[PDB]
Amino acid sequence: EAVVISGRKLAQQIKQEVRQEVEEWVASGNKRPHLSVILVGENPASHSYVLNKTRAAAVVGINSETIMKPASISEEELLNLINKLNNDDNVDGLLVQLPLPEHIDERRICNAVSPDKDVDGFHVINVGRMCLDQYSMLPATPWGVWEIIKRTGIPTLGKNVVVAGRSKNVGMPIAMLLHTDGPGGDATVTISHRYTPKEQLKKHTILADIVISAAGIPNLITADMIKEGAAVIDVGINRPKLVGDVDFEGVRQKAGYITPVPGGVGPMTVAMLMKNTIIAAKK
């Protein structure tokens, strides 16, 4: 029987560590950290997730607002709002929720956020710093996947990792961290492209000590694809239920570890954003 890692529990604990770090920072006579989340449009999933982010900001003692704007906002307007927020000394953390509308260039928006306030780590210089190990802020989801592995004590040195990426933005940062020298990880890493058929993907996943699915494909990962005792992290959201890319009940029989959906990586993602926000608040 595979042991199930409660992401929700591990993330709740991380918030408590952040909680106490914020109260110490404030008791020592500094300003309360403030996180701003910009929400454009009415994607219901984006609302759900941004709600989760401000909930957690409240739990850990961080002041938060979600500035919601209509989907018809122009790129020039969104840039002026980010400029306002960049220049407000009360705002320490600033993230724009994605995806944005087609008439806004996502690259230009993320690059407009101050790198000091970029609690998603999506500004191009914070991407470079992460590739080059000059960072102080990691993107929240890849960092959350690392914390699962690390806090669980799943060994990584030399081991084989396979990541099944829906995009480069989604799987490469996970691989980035898990491949880097000792957050190191010192692993051989495979990043699967969504144009590799599942038949070939199985050829890689069976060699893997850790399989991390980030493909957004229900039942992409099943027991035949996994080796005995391997660790399986599920990063996919797939929608009247919400499930991951793993066949949970199937691979629960042969995996060594597994994360559930919901209650796995998603809480960890929100947790790591709190760590980034207090980091930003200390300059």
Add this chain to the structure above:
Amino acid sequence: EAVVISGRKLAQQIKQEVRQEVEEWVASGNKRPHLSVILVGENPASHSYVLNKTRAAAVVGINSETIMKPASISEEELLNLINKLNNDDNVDGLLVQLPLPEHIDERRICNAVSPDKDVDGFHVINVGRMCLDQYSMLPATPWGVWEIIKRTGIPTLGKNVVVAGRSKNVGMPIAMLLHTDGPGGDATVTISHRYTPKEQLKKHTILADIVISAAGIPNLITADMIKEGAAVIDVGINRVPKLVGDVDFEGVRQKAGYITPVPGGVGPMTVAMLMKNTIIAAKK
């Protein structure tokens, strides 16, 4: 037996394209592109490599200077020199040949090159732009390996690529390009760590349609690790008094479907792609 890709000949057409581009660009009455390369110390390999680069610049119509500073230069004086060049409007391309002396932090030096002049793409902003598909300029050796593959017409989409990196600096940018969406080849990519047993690597390379070795250990790649018709691309540079790659050239030439020699393989491609980055930089 295996087709042997000539890096010399591939680079030759790439260089011919750059000469045409440069002359049409000068024909419109623009400043002739200029490249400055800073050479610290007396590493013989490094002087050889910088010379190759200045030769290529001359023959493609790009003016060039190599500024040789002694190893005992201080990090401060090197940063002053980089600052002068960043500000000189005649200088379009600036690169610092690596490695540097132990007393200088290569990371601060590389972030001191203006990102507009950074024809190696080693500045932290340009590393991010390449990660994020936002770049003007790609690191020469990864781009060179890509052009080998793409100009030889080796299929990549959904195929299995294995990269054997000596360091993350080396194999990650190569993997990054081949894993990207269509440069960018839509491929599955494995990046072996230097901390990898040869037989564990074997378990991945056997499955590989493209093995790219950049580990700097000779005979790392032998035929027993390739599958028939796979493409093997040798990025290593080893001494054994002879210069050789990471593959067993003779043995893999039977099983492989494609193979690159060393020398005359990836090396000349690296020099060629740096000319492309230079005309790009000049155009802003």
